[PDB]
Structure formats: structure tokens, C-alpha cells
Amino acid sequence: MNTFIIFIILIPIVGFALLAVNILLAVYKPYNEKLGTRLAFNAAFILVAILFLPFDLEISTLLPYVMSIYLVSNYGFTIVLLFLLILIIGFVYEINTNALKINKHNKPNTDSLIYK
């Protein structure tokens, strides 16, 4: 009965109304010419969304700390410092390995012109 839930139920009423208005209102009239295996992908594509999740789980692990920041003063501060640095080391692993690059397969072919 608050003004919070009329919103939750009323935004769909907005949408249901408008796509009704078009489906009820516009021409359908389709045909064949109007209508209409698998590819390979590089490793960094799947890598960005797989390694996305362990950083996201860290960001919501900071979320209990920054609400409790006064109560654990000088002590939970250092525990969080150690937590953050332990994960910064895995991040410097990740950017030292050049993991998230897609790198181009053709060079200028650097190898020189020798003879005989």
C-alpha cells in the first residue's frame, strides 16, 4: 500500500499497453522476401566475462566493510588492506600475462633480406 509497489506493477502496464497499441493498430502483411554452422572466436572474448566474475565478487565483498567502517577502526582497516593487496597481486598477474588481448596474427614480417 505504499507508493513503491504501484510503480513495480505499473511500469509493465505502461509496456503491455504500448505494444498492445501497435499490435492492435499496425499492418502485419508479411511474405518470404520480407522475412529473413558456428564460428570460432578468440580466447579474450570468453576470458573477459569469465574473469569478470572474480572481480565482481570482490567488489561486493567490500560492501560489508564500507558499512562497518567505524566499528572496526584501525583493525578491520588493516584486514581490508591485506585483502585488497592479495587481490591486487592476482590482478598484476593478469596484466603481466597480457591475458585480455586479442593480438593481430600478421606482422610486417620483420625478417631481413639476405642472399646466396
Partner 1 sequence: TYYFIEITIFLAILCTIFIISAKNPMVSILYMIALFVIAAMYLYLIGLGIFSLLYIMIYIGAIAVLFLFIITLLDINSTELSVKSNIRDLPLVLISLIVLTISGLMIYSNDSILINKLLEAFGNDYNTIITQDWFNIENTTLLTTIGNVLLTNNAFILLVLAIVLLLGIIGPISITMKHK
Partner 2 sequence: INANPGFWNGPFRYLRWSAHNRPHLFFAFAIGIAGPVAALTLTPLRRKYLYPDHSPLPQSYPLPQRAREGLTGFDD
Partner 3 sequence: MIINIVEILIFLVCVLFSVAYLTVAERKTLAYMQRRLGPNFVGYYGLLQAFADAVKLLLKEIVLPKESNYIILVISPLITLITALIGWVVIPLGPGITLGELNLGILFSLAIGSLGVFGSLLSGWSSNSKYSLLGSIRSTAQLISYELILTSIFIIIIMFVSSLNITTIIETQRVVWYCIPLLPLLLIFFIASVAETARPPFDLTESYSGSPFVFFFLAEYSNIILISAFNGYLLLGGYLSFNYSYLFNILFNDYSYVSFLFEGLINSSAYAIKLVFLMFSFIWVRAAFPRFTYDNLINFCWIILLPLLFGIFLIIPSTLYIFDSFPTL
Ligand X SMILES: CCCCCCCCCCCCCCCCCC(=O)OC[C@H](COP(=O)(O)OCCN)OC(=O)CCCCCCCCCCCCCCCCC
Ligand Y SMILES: CCCCCCCCCCCCCCCCCC(=O)OC[C@H](COP(=O)([O-])OCC(O)COP(=O)([O-])OC[C@@H](COC(=O)CCCCCCCCCCCCCCCCC)OC(=O)CCCCCCCCCCCCCCCCC)OC(=O)CCCCCCCCCCCCCCCCC
Q: Which of 88, 99, 100, 102 binds ligand X (CB under 6 A)?
A: 88
Q: Which of 49, 66, 25 is nearest to 100 (CA)?
A: 49
> Is 25 or 66 the residue whose CB approaches partner 1 more closely?
66
Listed in sequence order, the residues at least 6 apart from 91 whose beta carbon sits closer than 8 Å to its beta carbon are: 55
Identify residues 50-69 at the interface with ligand Y (CB under 6 A): none
- Residue 108 binds what, of partner 2, partner 3, partner 1, none (CB under 5 to 8 Å, by partner type)? none
> Is 18 or 46 the residue whose CB approaches partner 1 more closely?
46
d(CA 82, CA 86): 6
